[model samples]
Target: TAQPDPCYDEHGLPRRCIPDFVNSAFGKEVKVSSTCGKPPSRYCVVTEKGEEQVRSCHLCNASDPKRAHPPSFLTDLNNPHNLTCWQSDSYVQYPHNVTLTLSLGKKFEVTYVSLQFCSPRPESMAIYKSMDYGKTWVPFQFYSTQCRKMYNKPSRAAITKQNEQEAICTDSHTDVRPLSGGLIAFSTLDGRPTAHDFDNSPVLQDWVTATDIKVTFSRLHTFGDENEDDSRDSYFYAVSDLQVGGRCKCNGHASRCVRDRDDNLVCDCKHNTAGPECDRCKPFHYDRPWQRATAREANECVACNCNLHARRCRFNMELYKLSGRKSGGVCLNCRHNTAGRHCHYCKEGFYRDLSKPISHRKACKECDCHPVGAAGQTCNQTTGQCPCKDGVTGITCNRCAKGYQQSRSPIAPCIKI
Candidate 1:
């Protein structure tokens, strides 16, 4: 007998067959498993020397195990690069929506933060700062949508000039210094999430360099708002790790620290002395062997030494011999009407009595007239001479000349000239 056709579907096809010997040998007809669907396995046949056998079995059930991929990015809040990434994200809401953390414990002095948005929004975004790890947040200042637009394309060169002008106007401001160890946060002014659509573009949230601090950003919008979210590229950011250490002290308390021309560290001191090493004094203040003296002695010398006028000495006599001192290495006693240790000046009314004391010698003691009068009676210290009574012509009211007559008028001269 010929082999029957292989099994077919219901459209008038041959049905499956089994071999007679194989079925009978087992005391029963062998049948192919119907559950197995495919070519020859569905067909059975009895041949001259045939036994039933499965043509095929379904491929072994197996599947590859699931595997995990490593994260492509890491956010390190401490470092500037990582912090820049964090700030690049669009923060949805305000009052703690975004925050930056510092791994190292340090104090940072934040000068100013700038923000840039893709376009104007109805509501303004407010910036905040968080020193702690998001536990508490503080509102720093608020920036409106209009304000952000102004800074959309901030030029570093121009910003530098602007900062310089501001520094000149203000009493204290610096373009140099490292800013570290602080967290910057942002929120909305209205306490609601301002709708923004940043497709996925990174925004410059905070950029702090040794010279400047800047913040560039876009707004965060509602999830499904088409118009607001139209921008396929927008982001927010919070930056840290600003170069803060410089030559100038942060609060002007330390003299050694100051900022150099290149925004590097330098020494700011009263004298020309500088550097991290304050080893020497400035030009005007020289470093002498005496500078090595004890602090107490040094301070005492600073107090006693008259700048350019005099110097200090162990003996007062030595001080008396200085250029401005008197003769005999002694401080001269001022004359009766004069004052001061030098005895150089005269009394108010009396001129220097050059006759008596040769140095600052004499007073203008003698009256204009002299010969005929007694020596004891003299001019007053202020008026020069006593008022002569009427009819007085000579030095002591002694004479009336032949042509001059004596008058008894105290207001007139002793004799008419």
Candidate 2:
């Protein structure tokens, strides 16, 4: 019931952050590979020996549909006892596979995944997770009566440093008794060694990040051996409820996922972070590499050090690498006669005063050398020394050399004596 406290302190430094948890599957659509009664077909029941039940794929509370049980029922909040389940099409065959996929539309740090079965739990099933929206999938957990024979994974194996993220096969959830309403709950970080120190473990952190989840049913539980002539319609997948407990993948930068102008959910980013998942630094704030907030450090994005000469800054990979990965901010459109990548140096006609701070407005003073006496507008950056012409002398090139004399003409401010 309680949410995580503020992640930032008064100094704007990152502290420990824990985003609000949620049931990500609530009000979400579950996609079933196949649904029973798509064209009003006959299906068999385990209880009824010779009788067949007719069903159809229809929406919830539809207009007088027979046995209307669609994929939407799997994510419904209320668990009704009636025909409110997502059942797969019955096949009169020995082996069949049914896949139920849930696309979250955003990344989530999953804590646990629970499924309530409307039919007997399958003898062989596997749960998979995808971090790249559904392009690739990795095993989360596997359940089978014969784990070694089916998946080559031992039942309830111990996790080690090298295999902390490996999915473990369990024989506990596959039971044919009671025939229905069995629950299978899988905790993501339950027995792992680094579960306690999850914040410091990048491997465990990435292991729990998921954008899509899938449940596959490979083999159904049966009491007796089946024959070609025997009825096999009773063997099918049926799920009443699916719940995924997790939080939005905000990278410890936000406490909530707020709705944008388009009514789409987005992270309320903090710590100078941007993007839907707070995965990158905000513009003009990339003084350092973006990092996920942890207990020890907030890793907040720092504004570029433009020395008060520029309002905008850009990140350069080459500069960053050259600076030993310290900083890479390049100031843009430098004002106050400033120049250089960080606006630290002065422009061509100006010189940086050693007595003034870099951030001072008058730090970059104008050369103001005599046009006729000085060779060019440029000056020495440190000493403000101007380049003197043939018979010119002095710091500003306004005076003549020892053996030369001053002239009234602007073209020749100094002349040979």
Candidate 3:
């Protein structure tokens, strides 16, 4: 989410942006997501035949007529990318997240996703998944991972710059494997790398099925933080194509997988399975869907336990990462003053057995007490202790009251007389 030009000077040339070849499809193609101070739409759009161009943001600079916004429309895969884009003002970090989602109307078992991004300029991405209509999300895998460079430059010593100037610039679609990064769209703009990227091979991650997939593509590298006053990063993060892969026998929300495709077993699945066979689980039933199975052990699709008081839920992701244990699901944002392994207990200042296993019926118990002998009803969650009333003291206030003396027997009471 950045401007095509990072210089903050909207009039400067050599700026990065795309051209809106579409006659009047400008605003519809891309408009302002939101705006901030000092910029009254620096992203200028020429109005009526000769009217002063209309502007909406102090965004990407535009010297060249083709330079639109979105900094080359880089996130997309179309040639030089596009110029349509938007963002919030006052950037904080360089390597940040920009997410985009697509729905298939129903829950389909998606094995893989494709992000057709321009190459040469690298993209760092983090993969995420949200099954409950994107009410929440969890980490899945990687894409354009910043830590991993897409393709290593071939031994350049074998191809010198002088030899390349002689053999380049003829065809935009030529091998140019014989050229240098300095040539083509690989060229720089405003001292920054252009998005003329490569196909480093497509389709990210192993085949894992899901309904909603979130891709957070981190585009550029920031030079300095508060130190640089004017830090910078990439202008574009393009995408030419986006697809949901894996041929499913059926595609619907109420579907299931036939045991496992990675299992390579005889279709020993139950009917009404929406996936290839019956390896996947139905929509909500997959809160803890089995991804793998074995002779000694088999993962089951454990329904989420939201204390029956929750409207949303998901598996205990941390637990899965901890011991590879998939016992059941945990409430997503367990609300109603409840939270725990299953949103079955009070937040705090409420009492419940720490020893007993998770069960909503056995709801948390409040600390009830008399004000005369003891303070407010609220008690220590663990020990159920409250402030002693008057002069009464001890764990349960079963003792003396100031002038009152201790008794001989444990059950004996004390009097203030």
Candidate 4:
């Protein structure tokens, strides 16, 4: 057996025997890569897509509450020195931790969480969120650095330098993404990024949403001083602040509209738009709205209504944000001589029979020949009339030019009409 290493106990193992063991011990954190020391399924993918801060706070609850710090203190918006914080009820002494839970009042498209702790010996912390209230809980993220004294050093130089262990200290507010564990799983299980920032993909944007959140803070080896040496000694973790953010949502839905201050609903609209309830066209596809914006009923972004010949259709941003957000929008730039907001009418020379219903598809007709003569194939789009030939001279060019009486059936051309 290996002689008892200074860092090891009677079992004689090196500090944190299996760095990977840390993985199995705590079920909250996810491993980012194969070398990350965690199971293939439980890891995080580092990301840079940052999230915005949630401006509002909701009512909160905790395992313990004392005025110095209440369970609801996390979101009280009061970050006094970041230490006038919440402390667990009796005491957060040795070997035990505290859990704080909260109901955000309303739902949120939570993508990131910012934390401001007031403790020094915090070793590991885990976050969780629920969509259907507290009936179910899912791990959102986990963070751990070093707090416990893994190595029992014996030298005077090292001790003199100050027995500093990796602690979750520093007033620096820490931030973590909601979907890295939430996203890493989806990315591994499928191909989705479960994105909260990328605007192009609707599927990924809606993947991570939550209504409630919880946090557990552990504090066991705080400097390992006389105060923390005995299990009976009183040790505790502090929480000064915390905030969640992503897209401000309305009624738990992020697709229709977003609420910042809750007064004027500034739509965070998507292609057709993310609105309170606007009727509009989806991206790439333009169409007409049923009517102008109104409060009673929703508008319908009916159809692109463009002719098949049009190469493309564009959407005007102004049109989508109508008074009531109705869509009368698709104004097709004529192609193949076709013209109309819906693109089923004629441009200029091209004419369609007036008797035909405008709603009919392919209603426009070709006016290639002269309006009143047996002329050549080419004709004007608007005029629907052909130019006169050398010998013809009349409104319809039907004249018997001097000797050319090419009439009477096949011979009627160029003759008087």
Please identify model 3 stretches exceeding 4 Å from their true place: 1-95, 118-123, 143-207, 222-234, 249-417
Clashes of 2: 0
Question: Candidates' TM-scores?
Answer: 0.21, 0.82, 0.28, 0.36
lDDT of 4 by residue, 1-417 (tens): 265222233664212110100111111221110111111112111233456522221222332233234444555544454444444432343345566666553344555665544433344555666766577876544444432332122212221113121111221122222211111111111223332323343333333445566666544433344432342233344445555544443322113333557654443433243344222435435544322222222232344556464646665557668624545356545565567655666766456645655555445556554434435544454454556664555534555467555554543455433
* Each prediction's RMSD to truth: 35.7, 5.1, 22.5, 21.9
Runs of candidate 2 with Cα error greater than 4 angstroms are 1-5, 10-16, 42-66, 79-83, 91-94, 225-230, 260-264, 310-336, 353-363, 388-395, 399-405, 409-417
Worst 10 contiguous positions by lDDT, candidate 3: 197-206
The candidate 4 region of ten consecutive residues with least summed lDDT is 17-26
- Local accuracy by lDDT, each model: 0.28, 0.79, 0.39, 0.41
Q: Which one wins by TM-score: 1 or 4?
A: 4
Q: How accurate is candidate 4 locally (lDDT)?
A: 0.41
In candidate 2, what are the lDDT values of residues 1-417, reduced to their tens digit? 134448766675556455689888878998877776546555555553366533322322222345666888787766455546777766523356788899888889999998888778878889999999899999999988888888998878899998899898988878786566788888899888887998788899899999999988888765575444343446667778788999898988887888888887778887789998899979889777788888677777888988988888888888879999789778899999988888889888788787889888998778888878889778886678899887787777888988787778877777774
How many clashes (backbone N, Cα, C below 3 Å) per candidate? 42, 0, 33, 28
TM-score, predicted candidate 2 vs. hidden true structure: 0.82
* Candidate 2 positional error at 306, Å: 1.3
Model 3, C-alpha of 275: deviation from truth (Å): 11
Q: How well does candidate 4 score on lDDT at residue 384?
A: 47
Per-residue CA lDDT of model 3 for 1-417, tens digit only, reads 143432123454121111111111111132222222234223222123365533222344334333333422323333333323323233323444455555332333344454434322223444565545567765554333323243222211232322221111111222212211211122111111211211111121111233455555444433333533332222333333333453232212112223344653122233212244334754444355444222222333556657665666655556666645654456757664567766776766566655554454445555554445556566676575666655667645655667887554433345566
Which runs in model 1 stand beyond 4 Å of their true positions? 1-149, 152-240, 249-417
Instruction: Sort all candidates by TM-score, best to worst.
Output: 2, 4, 3, 1
